Each structure stands twice: as C-alpha cells, then as structure tokens.
RNA sequence: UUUGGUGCCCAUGUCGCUGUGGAAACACCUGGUUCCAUUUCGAACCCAGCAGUUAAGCACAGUGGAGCCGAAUGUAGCUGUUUCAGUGAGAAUAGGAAAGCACCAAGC
RNA sequence: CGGUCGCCUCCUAAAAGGUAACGGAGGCGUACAAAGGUACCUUCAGUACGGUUGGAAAUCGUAUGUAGAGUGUAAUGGUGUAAGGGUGCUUGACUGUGAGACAUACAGGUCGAACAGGUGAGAAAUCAGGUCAUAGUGAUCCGGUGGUCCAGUAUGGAAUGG
RNA sequence: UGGAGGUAAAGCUACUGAAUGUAUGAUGGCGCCACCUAGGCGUACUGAAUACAAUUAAACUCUGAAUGCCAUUUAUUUUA
C-alpha cells in the first residue's frame, strides 16, 4: 500500500486529470511500457493489485519500475451527513494519471511474458492501456 | 435521522488591505500623491519619491511617474517621478 | 579578513548611498580620498556624474601626508570652487574617520568661503 | 484590557500635557523626562503624574 | 593601551646549572628570580 | 628584544636560503598568539570566572575580554547573554615577550612536556597548544580558584601552507617531537 | 592612450588556476612621543616617514574548470475562429562569455 | 443541539483590484526608557581542520559557505554592509498645524509634502511628530479629575455649567 | 505604445515538503569473536550524503505568458 509518510496539509484541493502528459511520458528505465489514454484517478489499492499481478506473472530475473505514486489524498464525508460543518476526513490516496503518462515499465524477460504482464496490469486499472516501446 | 454533525474550525478571514500600484506609467502627478502601497518594499523608491511609516511610496514633486528596473538578474523594481522638465 | 582599502571602499559605498538619497538641493559633492602617501580631492556632481573641480598632492607638487599640506589642498580646492561660483557643498570622507587630515582640509575649505 | 498608561505633567506649571505607557512591574523608577510645554513655551522637565 | 596598575617591567631570569639571565617582560617583582628548570636544563632540548 | 633582532636576522637569511625565497618578506611571519581560557562554571559559580581573568591577566599583560556564547543549551545550563570564556590576543613586542617566556620558563616546567606536532597544524598554518594545568605557569601564586584548569594557547602565521609554518617552527626551535 | 581614483551598472562583470609588472602613483612597510583608538589588541581606526617590498592587494596576458548567459526549429499553454491562423513559453541544445559606459589627476 | 459573532496573515481568488460558503490553516485584546532618535563602528547560521577540563553540540583560531541566520510575535512581504549586532549622546515616544491623495454608504481608517515655535544627534549635509510593515481594540449618553483669558438668572460672590 | 502582476504552463540540483531506480555509501538491525570495555569481520537487510536518470504540489518556485487592468498618443462618436 503506497502511502506518503507525512503531508503538510491533510485536505488539499483536488488536482485535475484533464490535459496532456506532464512528465513520466516516455519509458526511461525499462524499454517496454504501459501508457494510459484517458486521465483518471487511480488509487494505491489498484497500484498494489497491479504490482502484485506483475510480480506474480514475472519470472526469477525480470525487473519492473512503478513511475506514478499516490501523492494526493481525498476525503469522503461520512454517510448520512448533510453538506456543511467542514470538509470530510481523508480516506484514500490516488495517483493522478493524465493522457500519456507511463505508469509501469518492465525489462529483462522475453517479449511475450512482458506483453502478457502489461495486459494483466492494465486489466486491473480503469484506464484503457496501450503498449509502447523505447526509442533506440 | 440527522445523527448530528461535527463542527468546522476555520471560517475566519481578515479585511483586505487596499495595497498595490496606484499611478500607472505616464500619468501626471503632483507632490504627495501615492504611487505604490506595499507590505515590505516591493517597489524601491527613486528620485522625487518618498517613503512612509507603512512602506507607502509617495511623490515629492510635479512630473510624470516612471518605473525603472534594476538589480541582480533584473529582479528589483524601482520607481521615480521624472519632473515635468518642460524647460521652455 | 580584508584589506584596509576594501573597508574604506565599503564605508564609501554607504556614504555615497546616503548622500544620493538625502541631498535634495543638488549640492556639489566634495569627495576627499586619502592614501598612505597623499590625499586628493575632487568635486563631483551626482546629477550629471562628472567632475567640476579637482585637486591633489600630485597636482600641487607637495610631499603630503602632513597636516601642513592639508591646509594648502583645502585652500586650493576652496579657491577653485569659489571660482566655479559653487558654495553649497556636501562634504564626505573617502571612508576614513573625519579627523586629522580630513578634518583639517574640511575646516580649511570653510574659512575660504564655503558653506558646509 | 490592561492599563499600562501613565500621565506626564510639567514641573513648573504642574500641568499634565502628555500620555504615554510604562510597565510598573519591570521599570520601578519614576519617569523624569524633559518635553515641550505649551504654557511655558519651552523645554522643561516632565514627571509622572498619578 | 596604557594607564595600568600591573606594570610589565623588564625582569631578568636566572637558572640553575646554566645561569642564562634571560630578560623578559612581566608584571612581577623586580629582582633575579632563579628558575630551577629552564629550557637549557632539560634532557629533551639537549 | 635582543631575541627579536635574532628573529629578524636569522629567520630572514636561513628561510630565504632554504627555499630560494625571492623576497625577504616571502618568509613566513607569525602574527598573534590568542589565549582562550573559557569555562562554563560561570553559569553557576560566577565568582570563579573573575579570578580566572586575573590569572590570565597576570600571565600576558593584556586584560582579558570575557566572551559570550552565540547560542543557548539546556544540557550545559547555557543561555545567551552570559560570559563564558576569556580571549587574549598579543601583538607587537608583548607577543614575542610572552612567547619567549612560555617556551623558556613555563613550558619546560610542564610535568611531562613530551610534545605533539605534525598532527597539530589545522591545515592553514596555525598551531594550538593545549595546556593541562595552570599552576605550572610561573606568573601564578599558589592561591587560586578551587578548580584548576589548563590553557589553549594558539598560533597564527603569515603563510597559508602548514609545511612552511612547520619550517618557521623549526627555525624558531619550538620543541616538539620531530617537529 | 596607460596608471590611480570614482560614478553608473549588477556575473556574458563572478569563483578559481597559470605567468608578467612597477617610472610616477597604489600598496604592503617603518614606529606609537604627540591628535585619535581597542568591548583587549597602533590588529583595525589615527598619527609621521618611505628604509625595504613585488608575496599580497592591485594591473595586464592566457586558462571554457565551476558558476552565469543562451540562438533557430519544435512543443505545452492562450485569443479568436476553427476543428486552423496568429501568439508564443518552460525544459533541453549548438554556442557565447576571462565585462562594459563616462569624468578627473599625471607621464603620455 | 453543537459551533461561531470584533480585528490581523496566507490559500481558495481565475498574473490589476475586488469576490462567498457551518471552505482549508493560523494568531491577536500585545512587547520595548529600549527593541525609540541620532552619530560612529561592525556583518550570517551551518560545516571542515586544529586544541585541557569539555563530552555530538558551550568557547578559540582559520577556511569554506551566498541566506537555510537574525529582524520580540501568526503568517505574508521585505531586508545579507541592510531594516541585523555593538558603542556614545539623547528623548522628535515634540507643540500649533497641515496643501494634496487612497479607500470608503456613513461613521471611521491610511499616507503625507510643507509652515511656525523650541529641542536631540551630528563637523556639516541631514535625520527625529515612535519601532522593518500589516492585528494589540469600543461610538454616544452619564458622571468624576486637572487646567482654563467663557457664563455666573437684579448687583458682588458662590452654586452650577462651558 | 508603455506599465503593474506571478495565474495557465513548466520545473524541482532554484528552495520547502512528498517521492522511483542504479552506483558509492554514514547509520542501525542482524550475527560471529575478543573484550566487560574500547571494539573488530561479514551483513537475508534499514537507509544519511553524493553522482546519474526520472517524478508531485491551492497554501513549492530558478522561470513564466496570453487575456484582462491602468495611463497616454491618434482617429471617430455623445453631452453624457
Ligand atoms: Mg487579506
Ligand atoms: Mg607578483
Ligand atoms: Mg446554541
Ligand atoms: Mg484577476
Ligand atoms: Mg487579484
Ligand atoms: Mg514571522
Ligand atoms: Mg543607540
Ligand atoms: Mg530598530
Ligand atoms: Mg446612563
Ligand atoms: Mg447674580
Ligand atoms: Mg500548474
Ligand atoms: Mg521538489
Ligand atoms: Mg501554484
Ligand atoms: Zn510648564
Ligand atoms: Zn638551566
């Protein structure tokens, strides 16, 4: 469960996911990568699920990198509460993925297993994923 | 059922102090008119421009106000009042 | 930590900033620069950034560094200022404490018609 | 509110002409300042007045 | 600086074995104080 | 001082010849012997500090200025605005007088002056002497503070190289082991 | 023109490295008896003199090392109307860069 | 029912300003006869080395370091020769005023050239009508206190007012 | 035409936090010895600092627009 160790402000304004890709746009640690095509909020739970899926379908020597990190927190008012009397308390952390950000990358294992691995990683995430390779 | 709700603690704000630039470049000015109000010297004073007890810049003579950029990496701003200088 | 001249330059930067900030009547500025051997004097005008009058031990051809030749330097520069028809002056030191040669030259300038 | 104020009165016409502040806990000694007096039209010693 | 109660007076110093009357400024009694171990009376220096 | 003239003539010629120094003042020159006898006991038994100064006073001929800390520490009971430590800086004739008196009278009286050198230069040419006890200094009567302490005599030089500082020390015969 | 002083400027002006220099001046330097000074020290400030001095500082030449500056193309954001025309960044880069502008005194 | 009611700082506030919510964070109802005024002098914190007590860290010397230091305070802005530190003398922490502006429904608030009187620092130029700036505050009525060139119910006082 | 600003954007070796991998690695945990206290050899592993490559921010900024705002210049229009 990826979680910031501490934050200066518990309840910040939400960060939009509409727009192009600011950073983490090109595979730069591995050479195959899973890009997103629709910005959305995805939480550390989906990240951990996808990472465990990748690790389970990896081998004995494959290596993986997680680019995105759930920096921003979000609140949720308790149920049966009418609006007012302040903001709700923070519940879960989501990493903000914009159209074009490479979330996971893999290397050091043959091509078919990595393609399958990225497929299973992307089926755990709501965004519609796509495979790209690293420029020589 | 309402079940009751907690209480918020920060709904407090102070009156807005009316700071900022008052006379724009090229505007004619007489002595004693405010050119720039600030909290801490955001605009330095030049010639024919004074300072107050609230870091307020005011004119000292007739003329056209004029801003001059100066300082390291061109990060400091300076204002002045170039006198009418009609000089026939 | 530094050398004497740099500290003298530092004091001069303070004095120049102060004079340029408060001299409202645009008086001529009688700058004296003292060295280990000699002391010179020049009257700048901070509105035009030029030199109106000048005087020096080299100009006056004296074995200076004494209070005696300081009297001569003050008299010469005061005579030149009177000839230039400027009498409203501001007096600043080169960054040295106003005393001895600087005080003698400044007082010498005052009895020859200067007002400061 | 706290009352740190004190009154300063002349010592020639015995008129009170100034109002200032003083900490009785820290400063124990009476003020003996010298200020302008409207009546005497000069500078004169002004002392603390109850 | 000056105007002091402790005067630094040039006092001579004698030593055992080797006389070596070294004159050094100090604020003490004005006479030939004899030192028992001086620099020259030490196995380390010579 | 006659040894001051000895310093002038001898140091000039030998160092100049020793390194083919192109100017007589290229040779290193010693500047100031700072003495700093500081103690934190002034936080509680202030009286002691006063006596400290006088002994320091009685040793150098310059009245000591008491120094103040630039911070505050609870564990040491330290607080800003207090006087903890005196520093004296001797120059001109008096500095050579005190230096000569130390090396010739005070130092060889040290219980075991076996010395420490080569491993004392700060890398810029300086030198610090950590004295262990005060009673050994001749300019001190038996009556003193209830606690006895040492000294931190230090040295400065015109040169910036520690090796040239050591060379001056060897030319001056400062008696340390092999240095 | 060069040296010395200074103002304007506020790194393409810096930090550093390597060499050269002094005629006059600038500096270190020589002493504290005078005016003046140390929260203590003629260190500094202040005196009165230039014996020595080119280490410094200072001034020149080289040095692209650090720091600084940074083109064109393209792109992101904007304004309109389009779903295309302008506006155009930041980052990155080729690369520049060993300051510049005036006044005064001296031999020139 | 709980919470809040005046004033100050930041964000939301969309690069002029303004802009709300039981939106998100904090403080204030002060402190300084020096932490004011002037003249002079002076400039980080930290880190590296070297040194008795003394220790990770007290002080000293030297170098490095361009602000992470200080600027009484909650933040913001400003300020490293400054607005920070020290010293000497002082009280302008004045009197009567005040052209002209800002912002404002009003009431109130904020800046201020300049004049007269008499001062402080400083050789002088100059500066000083409280502090680096923004919170530290409550109208009217009523009564009390000091001064006073005004009134004093026929007149002189007094009472009582101004 | 000139200006004020610090948003969009972008960047985090230009700060404050958050934060990924690689390399060198303070540090501890973990051992095994000697030594009762000064310590030492490896560390399933934690991870200061540095270098390389990559990230995040209403209350982060070494930067950084357009629009909008103020004033002025010219042309036209209205007595508001
Ligand atoms: Mg506000
Ligand atoms: Mg040379
Ligand atoms: Mg209620
Ligand atoms: Mg706006
Ligand atoms: Mg605004
Ligand atoms: Mg603050
Ligand atoms: Mg003072
Ligand atoms: Mg102050
Ligand atoms: Mg009533
Ligand atoms: Mg009557
Ligand atoms: Mg943005
Ligand atoms: Mg960052
Ligand atoms: Mg922002
Ligand atoms: Zn009176
Ligand atoms: Zn002997």
Curated annotation (Swiss-Prot), chain A:
SUPFAM superfamilies: Ribosomal protein L16p/L10e (SSF54686). Signal peptide: none annotated. Gene3D superfamilies: Ribosomal protein L10e/L16. The keyword Lipoprotein does not apply. One of its GO terms (cellular component) is cytosolic large ribosomal subunit. The keyword Plastid does not apply. CDD domains: Ribosomal_L16_L10e. GO terms for molecular function: rRNA binding; structural constituent of ribosome; tRNA binding. Keywords: Ribonucleoprotein, Ribosomal protein, RNA-binding, rRNA-binding, tRNA-binding. GO terms for biological process: translation. Binds 23S rRNA and is also seen to make contacts with the A and possibly P site tRNAs. Belongs to the universal ribosomal protein uL16 family. Part of the 50S ribosomal subunit. This is Large ribosomal subunit protein uL16.
From Swiss-Prot, chain B:
GO terms for biological process: translation. The N-terminus is cleaved by ribosomal processing cysteine protease Prp. It comes from the Bacteria. One of its GO terms (cellular component) is cytosolic large ribosomal subunit. Keywords: Ribonucleoprotein, Ribosomal protein. GO terms for molecular function: structural constituent of ribosome. Belongs to the bacterial ribosomal protein bL27 family. This is Large ribosomal subunit protein bL27. The gene is rpmA.
Curated annotation (Swiss-Prot), chain D:
GO terms for molecular function: structural constituent of ribosome. Keywords: Ribonucleoprotein, Ribosomal protein. GO terms for cellular component: cytoplasm; ribonucleoprotein complex; ribosome. Coiled coil: none annotated. It comes from the Bacteria. One of its GO terms (biological process) is translation. Belongs to the bacterial ribosomal protein bL33 family. This is Large ribosomal subunit protein bL33A.
Swiss-Prot record, chain F:
One of its GO terms (molecular function) is tRNA binding. GO terms for cellular component: ribonucleoprotein complex; ribosome. Keywords: Ribonucleoprotein, Ribosomal protein, RNA-binding, rRNA-binding, tRNA-binding. Pfam families: Ribosomal_L5, Ribosomal_L5_C. GO terms for biological process: translation. Part of the 50S ribosomal subunit; part of the 5S rRNA/L5/L18/L25 subcomplex. Contacts the 5S rRNA and the P site tRNA. Forms a bridge to the 30S subunit in the 70S ribosome. This is one of the proteins that bind and probably mediate the attachment of the 5S RNA into the large ribosomal subunit, where it forms part of the central protuberance. In the 70S ribosome it contacts protein S13 of the 30S subunit (bridge B1b), connecting the 2 subunits; this bridge is implicated in subunit movement. Contacts the P site tRNA; the 5S rRNA and some of its associated proteins might help stabilize positioning of ribosome-bound tRNAs. Belongs to the universal ribosomal protein uL5 family. HAMAP family: Ribosomal_uL5_B (MF_01333_B). This is Large ribosomal subunit protein uL5. It comes from Mycoplasma pneumoniae (strain ATCC 29342 / M129 / Subtype 1) (Mycoplasmoides pneumoniae).
